[PDB]
Amino acid sequence: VSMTKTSVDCTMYICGDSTECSNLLLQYGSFCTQLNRALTGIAVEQDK
Amino acid sequence: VSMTKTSVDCTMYICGDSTECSNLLLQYGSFCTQLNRALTGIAVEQDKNTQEVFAQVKQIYKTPPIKDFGGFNFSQILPDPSKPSKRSFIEDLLFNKVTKFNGLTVLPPLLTDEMIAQY
Amino acid sequence: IANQFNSAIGKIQDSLSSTASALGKLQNVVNQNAQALNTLVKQLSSNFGAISSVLNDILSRLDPPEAEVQIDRLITGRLQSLQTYVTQQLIRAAEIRASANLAATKMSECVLGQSKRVDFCGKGYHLMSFPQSAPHGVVFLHVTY
Amino acid sequence: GAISSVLNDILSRLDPPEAEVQIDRLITGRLQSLQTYVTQQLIRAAEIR
Amino acid sequence: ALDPLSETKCTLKSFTVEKGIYQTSNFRVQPTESIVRFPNITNLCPFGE
Amino acid sequence: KNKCVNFNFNGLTGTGVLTESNKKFLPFQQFGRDIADTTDAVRDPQTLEILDITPCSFGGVSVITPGTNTSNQVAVLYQGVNCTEVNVFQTRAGCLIGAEHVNNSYECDIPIGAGICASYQT
Amino acid sequence: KNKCVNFNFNGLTGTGVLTESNKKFLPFQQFGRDIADTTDAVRDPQTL
Amino acid sequence: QCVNLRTRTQLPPAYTNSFTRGVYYPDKVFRSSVLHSTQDLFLPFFSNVTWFHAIHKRFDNPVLPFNDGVYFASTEKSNIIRGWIFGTTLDSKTQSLLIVNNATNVVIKVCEFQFCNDPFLGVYYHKNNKSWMESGVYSSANNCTFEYVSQPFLMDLEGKQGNFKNLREFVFKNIDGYFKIYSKHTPINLVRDLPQGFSALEPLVDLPIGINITRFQTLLALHRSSSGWTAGAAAYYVGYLQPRTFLLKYNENGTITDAVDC
């Protein structure tokens, strides 16, 4: 019926609390926000 | 039932009038071609999804003028001929409650809204 | 029974003419496609590790062999933006198809006939159902005893 | 394809002009690793749906 | 490039073609002129001095 | 104006069609952008006038044909464009050339879009 | 100990909760690791 | 030059609030009925801003820093506040800037100006033909490298007591050598320190000077009908910016109407 919810911050997974790596990631665009929307949309479906 | 039909020119989106970009893009192969196949395949499904639902009848049936149904009033769901689009009151309320250049074009649907109301 | 039917019809006009979140299933489809398209266009302003996002600014500042390296970064990033968009729409096109096959199944069992299936053609004992069109979808008015 | 898999090992060892080339390789690899995960979960969730 | 019927056969990679509709290319209007606009270039220095 | 041309302004470049507009720029504003951070207007630097930047026309090209066994007569569709290059009929899908329009209605054999279809007959 | 802090244990950079180890170890061990190849523990170079 | 003015007295470090003041157009881009964000230097709303006052024994004009840009809200009954000093050392040792309003035009110069212990705009000889115009700023200038004059306008320095009616807000920062200014003019009813409202600040100029700046100081108008100078009645606020993320609500006609601090 359901699956285990998950949520993953793109930054901490890639840039382990590094300001340099983070600033290099902003120029890659909204790839991070898209991934958080998808996982959040999955978790909401498990409750429905 | 359906989604918006879209198509994206993979060359125009990446290489915005840049022959230098196009010559480099050719070294990636048919990555450009495969994307237009998937979106084209999606667009054909949105027309089948509409035919599978509404086109369940082989012939059109019309409502009679003498609307004597034993006290049942189907006026709010039957089409209003006074409107330009021959839709019902409820069909109009549902439409009101609902609301570029970089190679991105929107294809129209096969069946227009007037055709759906006829079914 | 006729007065009960005509009165229930009137309550629908009161609901759909005032409530906005009733058609959230259809509005989420429109908003989902719009965000994916706007997100696809906003990624053109991204550099992907290059000196700039614009090709002419790269071509009008740098040499060919230095620009071909940086131009390869925009292509690699912009190409992934399409795969991320096409792969999503393929999944969105599967949820819409299962919902469409369902609606085609309900138009046959509920409208074209009387269904003994519970909670498939409305809550209660199903008598008949009337369909209504809508943008990118369909509405069923399920009459029940 | 980088010198090391750790981030601080490159941050404390190489300069930004030389580290930026290395950190970009990790991001391209670690970013695809997420897209492969999120894409598969969306397909798995469709079976659960 | 002889006719659109041949552009189809090159797209499908088949000398034979079945009935239907087939997307072959992307029409694009090529620009005619090239406008250049810049504000007035007055306020020159008196180099004759 | 009213012509697909290239743009090289004081601090902006691009390509498109340029027309007048009713937009109210401020005295210090040079150009505007849309919701998607894409340019759609510009103030001429030598004349304080606002000008809309319409994109140049583009669209996919698709052919309408029966099978090769039947014949080789073919029609052509230019998606999402009025008739510009030029037996021709405008639709909500685009400028259709190579096919005749009829006031009669028949069954759909070759879909086009917006309620239009095609077929090879007498 | 028992505090989120930055550290440099003879080059073993990182950040996290340092606390006493209730785990065994080899005589020649210098540190430990988890399944993720992440530095899970460390030996101080001055007080082993 | 070196003599400290008779009306010199040190005011304390007061503080007050800021409802939504310190909001400007970060670029010359037009928008219409949208809501776009930005990442630039602004004032955090509801922050602590220093307050300063003047009156005919308390003359307030000290040295202040210019770390990451500043903000001005010059309440003015009589346009007492005239100009602003900028630079690092603020003397003939190295290049520095001056922005002087001589009641006819915004005179700007960049020279190694000679520093005084308390510069001011001297307005003397009010016995006949006062005229409330220009007449102890500096004493030498060398190696001037820049100049600028603005549109023609007319300001007045006639004394007026009581509470304020007009307010002129200004902004000052220097990024990559370019010195940017934003400002406006609006009336008010100064019932309190500052008003609880919102209004955007438009750009004024953009000078490609190309120097380092770390401090500044204000210039005020003194009457006299260095010791013998009548202090003025005025009040001015000071702020300091920070790199915060904001939202900007543009109306149909392109005028900003509201904003949000993220």
Geometric angle at alpha carbon G41, from G36 and G47, rounded to 5°? 160
Q: Which residue from B12, B40, B103 is facing E23, i.e. has the nearest CB?
A: B40
In the beta sheet, which residues pair with residue F96? Answer: F77, F89
Rounded CA-CA distance B70/C66 in Å is 83
Give me the DSSP letters along H207-243. Answer: EE------EEEEEEEEE----S-BPP-EEEEEEE-EE
Rounded CA-CA distance H169/H221 in Å is 18
| F7, F38, F39, F40, best to mutate vs chain C, most C CBs in 10 Å | F38
Looking up tokens 């939504």, which residue turns up? H20
Nearby residues of B11 by Cβ (< 8 Å), 6 or more positions away: B22, B25, B32, B103, E26
Geometric angle at alpha carbon H170, from H169 and H175, rounded to 5°? 155
Q: Which residue from F13, F35, F37 is facing C45, i.e. has the nearest CB?
A: F37
Nearest to A24 by CA among A34, A10, A36: A10
Rounded CA-CA distance F40/F54 in Å is 7
- Would you call H15 exposed, middle or buried from its count of C-beta atoms within 10 A (0-12, 13-18, 19+)? exposed
Tokens at F49, concatenated: 């006038």
Rounded CA-CA distance F76/F78 in Å is 7
Could you tell me how far CA C126 lies from the centroid of its own chain? 29
- Would you call A11 exposed, middle or buried from its count of C-beta atoms within 10 A (0-12, 13-18, 19+)? middle
Is A27 in CB contact (< 8 Å) with chain D?
no
Looking up tokens 């096969």, which residue turns up? B110
All residues of chain E having their beta carbon less than 8 Å from the beta carbon of residue B36 are 23
Rounded CA-CA distance B18/H118 in Å is 61
Is F114 in CB contact (< 8 Å) with chain B?
yes
- Domain positions in chain H are 14-262
Is B43 in CB contact (< 8 Å) with chain C?
no
Say whether D19 sits in a helix, a strand or coil: helix
Rounded CA-CA distance C108/C129 in Å is 10
All residues of chain B having their beta carbon less than 8 Å from the beta carbon of residue C17 are 93
**Distance, in angstroms, between F36 CA and closest chain C CA?**
6
Contact E23 B9 (CB under 8 A): no
CA torsion angle B111 B112 B118 C2 (round to 10): 110
Rounded CA-CA distance H30/H94 in Å is 40
3-state SS record for B92-110: HHHHHCCCCCCCEEECCCC
Task: State the pairing for strand pair H96-101/G12-17.
Answer: unpaired
All residues of chain B having their beta carbon less than 8 Å from the beta carbon of residue E26 are 9, 11-12, 103
Per this entry, what is the length of chain B? 119
Nearby residues of H232 by Cβ (< 8 Å), 6 or more positions away: H54, H55, H56, H59, H78, H80, H159, H220, H221, H222, H223
All residues of chain H having their beta carbon less than 8 Å from the beta carbon of residue F28 are 25, 28, 202-203
CB F52 within 8 A of CB F18: yes
Contact B4 C16 (CB under 8 A): no
Q: How many C-beta atoms lie closer than 10 Å to residue B40's C-beta?
A: 15
Q: Do chains H and G touch (3 or more CB pairs under 8 A)?
A: no
Query: Number of Cβ pairs closer than 8 Å across B and E?
Result: 7
Tokens at H78, concatenated: 């009589």
Q: How many C-beta atoms lie closer than 10 Å to residue B57's C-beta?
A: 10
Nearby residues of H82 by Cβ (< 8 Å), 6 or more positions away: H100, H101, H121, H157, H219, H220, H221
**F117 torsion bin: left (phi>0), alpha (psi -120 to 50), beta (else):** beta
Alpha carbons within 13 angstroms on the beta-carbon side of residue H160 total 15
CA distances from C38 to B102, H48, H92, H144 (A): 11, 39, 55, 51
Is C22 in CB contact (< 8 Å) with chain B?
yes
The H or E element containing residue H187 is: strand H186-187
Rounded CA-CA distance B114/B92 in Å is 12
Give me the DSSP letters along G1-48. Answer: --SEEEEEETTEEEEEE-----S---SS----B-TTS-B-----SS--
Which experimental approach was used here?
Answer: cryo-EM
Rounded CA-CA distance H148/H179 in Å is 13
Tokens at H93, concatenated: 């040792």
CA torsion angle B61 B67 B70 B72 (round to 10): 80
The H or E element containing residue H46 is: none
Say whether H170 sits in a helix, a strand or coil: strand
Nearest to H173 by CA among H73, H63, H47, H68: H68
Looking up tokens 């965000």, which residue turns up? C35
Rounded CA-CA distance C40/A10 in Å is 19
In the beta sheet, which residues pair with residue H243? Answer: H41
CATH number, span H14-262? 2.60.120.960
Looking up tokens 């550099």, which residue turns up? C47
CB F33 within 8 A of CB F39: yes
Task: State the pairing for strand pair F39-43/F31-33.
Answer: antiparallel
Looking up tokens 């190696």, which residue turns up? H143
Nearby residues of H256 by Cβ (< 8 Å), 6 or more positions away: H23, H25, H200, H248, H249, H250
Is G37 in CB contact (< 8 Å) with chain D?
yes
Tokens at H106, concatenated: 């915004």
Rounded CA-CA distance H21/H182 in Å is 13
CA distances from H15 to A12, E24, H64 (A): 39, 70, 15
Query: Which residue on chain F is closest to E9 by alpha carbon?
Result: F68
| Residues in chain E that come right before a backbone break, where C and next N are over 2.5 Å apart | none
Chains with at least 3 CB pairs less than 8 angstroms from chain H: F
Is D9 in CB contact (< 8 Å) with chain C?
no
Straight-line distance from the first to the last Cα atom of chain A, in angstroms, rounded to the nearest whole number:
10
Nearest to H231 by CA among H122, H137, H111, H151: H122
Task: State the pairing for strand pair F58-65/E20-28.
Answer: antiparallel
Rounded CA-CA distance A4/A20 in Å is 33
- Would you call C116 exposed, middle or buried from its count of C-beta atoms within 10 A (0-12, 13-18, 19+)? exposed
Query: Which residue on chain B is closest to E11 by alpha carbon?
Result: B33
Which amino acid would we find at residue C77?
A: G
Nearest to H73 by CA among H58, H52, H87, H59: H52
**Distance, in angstroms, between B98 CA and closest chain E CA?**
32
Per this entry, what is the length of chain E? 49
Q: Do chains F and D touch (3 or more CB pairs under 8 A)?
A: no
Rounded CA-CA distance H66/H44 in Å is 17
Interface of H with F (CB under 8 A): 25, 28-32, 34, 202-203, 253-255
- Would you call G12 exposed, middle or buried from its count of C-beta atoms within 10 A (0-12, 13-18, 19+)? middle
CB F17 within 8 A of CB F82: no
Give long-range contacts, CB 8 A cutoff, 24+ apart: C12-19.
C12/B76, C12/B90, C12/C141, C13/B76, C13/B89, C13/B90, C13/B93, C16/B90, C16/B93, C16/B94, C16/B97, C17/B93
**Distance, in angstroms, between C60 CA and closest chain F CA?**
12
Alpha carbons within 13 angstroms on the beta-carbon side of residue C90 total 18
Contact E16 F68 (CB under 8 A): yes
CB C103 within 8 A of CB C96: no
Rounded CA-CA distance C54/B16 in Å is 9
E:15-34 residues touching chain B, CB 8 A cutoff? 23, 26, 28
Nearest to B42 by CA among C33, C89, D39, E12: C89
- Would you call F94 exposed, middle or buried from its count of C-beta atoms within 10 A (0-12, 13-18, 19+)? buried
All residues of chain B having their beta carbon less than 8 Å from the beta carbon of residue F109 are none
Rounded CA-CA distance G48/G29 in Å is 10
Rounded CA-CA distance C48/B18 in Å is 18
Q: Which residue from F6, F84, F111 is facing E21, i.e. has the nearest CB?
A: F111
All residues of chain F having their beta carbon less than 8 Å from the beta carbon of residue B107 are 79, 93, 113
Q: Do chains F and B touch (3 or more CB pairs under 8 A)?
A: yes
Q: How many C-beta atoms lie closer than 10 Å to residue H91's C-beta?
A: 14
CB F73 within 8 A of CB F64: no
CA distances from G20 to G37, G42, G48 (A): 20, 10, 12
Rounded CA-CA distance D25/H193 in Å is 55
Nearest to C98 by CA among D41, D49, D45, B41: D49
In the beta sheet, which residues pair with residue F90? Answer: F95
Nearby residues of D4 by Cβ (< 8 Å), 6 or more positions away: D10
All residues of chain F having their beta carbon less than 8 Å from the beta carbon of residue C54 are 13
Rounded CA-CA distance F36/C45 in Å is 10
3-state SS record for chain F: CCCEEEEECCCCEEEEEEEECCCCCCCCCCEEECCCCCEEEEECCCCCCEEEEECCCEEEEEEEECCCCCCCCCEEEEECCCCCCCCEEECCCEEEECCCCCCCCCCCCEEEECCEEECCCC
CB H113 within 8 A of CB H96: yes
CB H245 within 8 A of CB H12: no
CA torsion angle D29 D30 D33 D35 (round to 10): -100
In the beta sheet, which residues pair with residue H223? Answer: H123, H230
Is C4 in CB contact (< 8 Å) with chain F?
no
Geometric angle at alpha carbon A27, from A24 and A33, rounded to 5°? 100
Contact F78 E38 (CB under 8 A): no
Q: Which DSSP state fits C111?
A: I
Rounded CA-CA distance H84/H73 in Å is 13
Looking up tokens 């005229």, which residue turns up? H131
The H or E element containing residue B46 is: helix B31-54
CB F84 within 8 A of CB F57: yes
Tokens at H128, concatenated: 């006949």
Nearby residues of C54 by Cβ (< 8 Å), 6 or more positions away: F13
CB H74 within 8 A of CB H80: no
Rounded CA-CA distance E20/F64 in Å is 7
Looking up tokens 């210098």, which residue turns up? G30
**H185 torsion bin: left (phi>0), alpha (psi -120 to 50), beta (else):** beta
Q: Which residue from B7, B100, B112 is facing F115, i.e. has the nearest CB?
A: B112
Straight-line distance from the first to the last Cα atom of chain D, in angstroms, rounded to the nearest whole number:
39
Chains with at least 3 CB pairs less than 8 angstroms from chain E: B, F
Could you tell me how far CA H58 lies from the centroid of its own chain? 19
The H or E element containing residue H256 is: strand H256-261
Say whether C97 sits in a helix, a strand or coil: helix
In chain B, where do the E strands start and end? 6-8, 104-106
CA torsion angle C15 C20 C23 C25 (round to 10): -140
Rounded CA-CA distance H184/H196 in Å is 17
Which amino acid would we find at residue F43?
A: R
Rounded CA-CA distance F19/F13 in Å is 16
- Would you call C119 exposed, middle or buried from its count of C-beta atoms within 10 A (0-12, 13-18, 19+)? exposed
The H or E element containing residue B15 is: none
Nearest to H148 by CA among H109, H184, H194: H109
Looking up tokens 């981030």, which residue turns up? D7
Say whether C54 sits in a helix, a strand or coil: coil
**Distance, in angstroms, between C117 CA and closest chain B CA?**
19
Nearest to H222 by CA among H237, H232, H213: H232
**Distance, in angstroms, between B108 CA and closest chain F CA?**
6
Rounded CA-CA distance F7/C83 in Å is 31
The H or E element containing residue B90 is: helix B89-96
Q: Which residue from C38, C45, C56 is facing F13, i.e. has the nearest CB?
A: C56
**Distance, in angstroms, between C39 CA and closest chain F CA?**
8
Positive/negative CA dihedral, B3, B9, B12, B13: positive
Say whether H13 sits in a helix, a strand or coil: coil
CB E40 within 8 A of CB F46: yes
Nearby residues of H28 by Cβ (< 8 Å), 6 or more positions away: F28, F29, F30, F31, H203
Contact A27 C48 (CB under 8 A): yes
